[PDB]
């Protein structure tokens, strides 16, 4: 009923590769092959 | 960085279009026949109140060499912190370019 | 005031550090550790901070926090080379306006680095035509031994 | 990636200092007279339960070529997913460098 | 009226706006800042998604 702030509590390891017409299309194909092609990644460092 | 008490689980069913905080590494190559690899590692502490360290690596090498490298980088990160290491979870992939390819490895952080 | 953590950050902290490392990523990590934010995940953002965000010394951050951070860094494996990273925060007179963050990195001295990032913030306000209240900054330099990293950042969090 | 059903709208009045999730492409050049471009495309699916796809592109070329390319990139993204394409929205900009210029294109996600 | 998308992971964006701009600058970062400004998003903190 009341959203509680929290840090991420799960971590998943995924990997993939792919060919592509352009570097970005290949990157996209890799994420898709890795299974995370339909979410937006916010790169953390 | 992996939050303390976080759990390594298989990729959950993520909402379409979700904004997922993710640590990743990738390499793109257009050199025909070249083998490129990407790898990710997660160093887990014995002291569960400490966080976990995520390391990524990418390069023109086999997946075997990439995973070996990224696992060592994670080890080094714990030594630098002086933290007791429980274990390291790692994953890697290799790709042999046909015309233009990309190898990608990531650690997706989410909530359950 | 509930759900504070779901709103915009209201503090900013300037940190900087340097370190050697066996690999570039390990050096960068060592640099973050040396600056005091080695155990949180950094979310690199564009150089803007919320209006009236308070500049404060780095707070005790929960490990694993996803910290929106504007930062600059430089990695060098050239023995004896001097590298620096600087960070500046420009606060506007008009409290309804956002603050500007500028980051800088290069093969120069800590002094030159800070001077440059300070000028960059000034230019940011000139380009906007905003009245400046003041600018705060810090810099760090590192002389590479084998492989080192100079890091400077403006971390946004909550008070 | 853009959430399913997300609506393409004119850039709203964004609060000062807001944190805005944004997909973007940019290119910076310090070569006098040189032309540089940046472009963004948003591919919308016919199936409304599916995500939108955002592609960005930047390079030393005209805005006509840059936009043509990013639009082709979105089409390819949909073909790799096997999704039916409804349409593609795109935008490009080109800048002729004087001393030091930057060309920037973006798909800013927001709320309504 | 405020939101930190990094914390409110359960609240997804529902609009997308295409913008573009360019600009000169005395430094790369300043040029970049000018471009965002010309594009209309120079006074916000961008969280890059990929
Ligand atoms: N599927 C994603 N979220 N990203 C990969 C493609 C990136 C297009 N700019
Ligand atoms: N301590 C950090 N959050 N980052 C340092 C670099 C490690 C990238 N995997």
Tokens of E42: 């120079």
| Torsion, Cα of C18, C23, C28, C32 (10° steps) | -80
d(CA C72, CA C83): 12
D23 lines ligand 1 (CB under 6 A): yes
Nearest CA to ligand 2 atom 6: C29
Q: How many residues does chain C have?
A: 159
Given resolution (angstroms): 2.0
Spacing, Cα B17 to ligand 1 middle (Å): 11
Phi then psi for residue C71, to 5 deg, are -150, 165
Structurally, chain A folds into a number of domains equal to: 1
In angstroms, how far apart are the furthest CA atoms of chain B?
47
Give the count of domains, chain B: 1
Q: How far apart are CA B66 and CA C108, in angstroms?
A: 34
Q: Tell the burial category of C93 from Cβ atoms under 10 Å away from its Cβ (0-12, 13-18, 19+).
A: exposed
Structural biology method used: X-ray
The vertex-D78 CA angle with D72 and D84, nearest 5°, equals: 115
Contact A7 C44 (CB under 8 A): no
Q: E41 lies in which domain range?
A: 1-50
The closest alpha carbon to C148, from C72, C82, C71, C70, belongs to: C82
How many angstroms separate the Cα of E6 from the Cα of each of C8, C118, D65?
Answer: 10, 29, 35
Give Cβ neighbours of residue B82 (< 8 Å, ≥ 6 apart).
Answer: none
B23 lines ligand 2 (CB under 6 A): yes
CATH number, domain at E9?
3.30.60.30
Class of domain C1-159: alpha beta
- Report residue C67 as tokens: 């910290």
Strand order in the sheet with D19-29: D7-8, E15-24, D101-110, D19-29, E45-48
Domain carrying residue B77: 1-112
Q: What is the CA radius of gyration of chain D?
A: 15
Query: Smallest Cβ distance to C43: which of A2, A5, A44?
Result: A44
| Residue E19 near residue D98, CB atoms below 8 Å | no
Return the CATH number at D39: 3.50.20.10
Tell which residue, C67, E5, A37, has the closest CA to residue D109: E5
């Amino acid at each position: 009923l009341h959203a509680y702030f929290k840090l991420p509590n799960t971590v998943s390891l995924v990997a993939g590769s792919s060919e592509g017409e352009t570097p970005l299309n290949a990157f996209d194909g890799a994420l898709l092959n890795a299974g995370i092609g339909n979410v937006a990644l916010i790169r953390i460092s | 960085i992996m939050p303390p008490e976080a759990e390594i689980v298989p990729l959950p069913k993520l909402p379409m279009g979700a904004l997922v905080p993710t640590a990743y590494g990738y390499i793109i190559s257009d050199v025909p026949g070249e083998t490129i690899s990407a790898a990710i590692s997660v160093a887990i502490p014995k002291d569960k109140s400490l966080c976990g360290l995520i390391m990524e690596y990418e390069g023109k090498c086999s997946k075997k060499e990439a995973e070996k490298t990224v696992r060592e980088m994670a080890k080094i990160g714990f030594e630098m912190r002086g933290w007791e290491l429980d274990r390291i979870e790692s994953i890697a992939v290799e790709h042999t370019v046909e015309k233009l390819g990309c190898a990608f490895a990531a650690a997706a952080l989410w909530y359950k | 005031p509930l759900h504070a953590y779901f709103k915009l950050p209201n503090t900013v902290s300037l940190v900087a550090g340097s370190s050697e490392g066996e690999t570039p990523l390990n050096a960068f990590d060592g640099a973050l550790l040396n600056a005091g934010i080695g155990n949180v995940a950094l979310i690199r953002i564009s150089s803007i901070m919320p209006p009236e965000a308070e500049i404060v010394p780095l707070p005790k951050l929960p490990m694993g926090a996803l910290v929106p951070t504007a930062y600059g860094y430089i990695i060098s494996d050239v023995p004896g080379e001097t590298i620096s990273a600087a960070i500046s925060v420009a606060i506007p007179k008009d409290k309804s306006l956002c603050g500007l963050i500028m980051e800088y990195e290069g093969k120069c001295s800590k002094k030159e680095a800070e001077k440059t990032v300070r000028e960059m913030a000034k230019i940011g306000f000139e380009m906007r035509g905003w009245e400046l209240d003041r600018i705060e900054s810090i810099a760090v330099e590192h002389t590479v031994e084998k492989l080192g990293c100079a890091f400077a950042a403006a971390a946004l969090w909550y008070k």
